Design a protein around this ligand. Sequence first.
Ligand code: HEM
Length: 154
Amino acid sequence: MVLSEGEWQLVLHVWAKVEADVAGHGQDILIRLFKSHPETLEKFDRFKHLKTEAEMKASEDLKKGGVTALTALGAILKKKGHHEAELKPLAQSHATKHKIPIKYLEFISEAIIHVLHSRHPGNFGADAQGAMNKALELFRKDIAAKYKELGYQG
Ligand code: HEM
């Protein structure tokens, strides 16, 4: 679909708050993902052995991974839909090296929404959440199309 500029501004205004502390937001988001959908943890060979939330919070590797993913997503969001160049390497690695189904991208999107709803009620009311959902749906739609071009059903 296509977001309006007003919708993009709602997305970017909450993202500005994430950027006060991307590392802490990334920890919360990955922990939420792994608690809600434990099968997703199996994809992370570096830290798939972690057993508890306490171990997850203490993991420097998990923290760095959250920073990497959220920073890449932030760069995509800041393109306001003009993200073709950014999606190419990401789709290739996630399709072919990491093997991340679209369903798992849905799960991480749900975790992002959950954490922003909890942390940022001042910038994540209903209209802002709808805008973020629309941005994440666009991201997933475009990645899914690239997955198919790359030979991965997703
Ligand atoms: C918003 C969605 C996501 C973004 C923006 C994102 C971004 C990234 C980036 C930038 C990297 C490092 C470069 C690369 O390999 O492409 C990475 C690595 C990786 N991603 Fe994602 N990712 C997302 C979702 C996921 C999900 C849902 C999973 C698994 C359920 C996943 C699994 C992995 C794995 C296993 C790696 C390699 C990690 C390592 O080397 O320790 N990603 N991701």
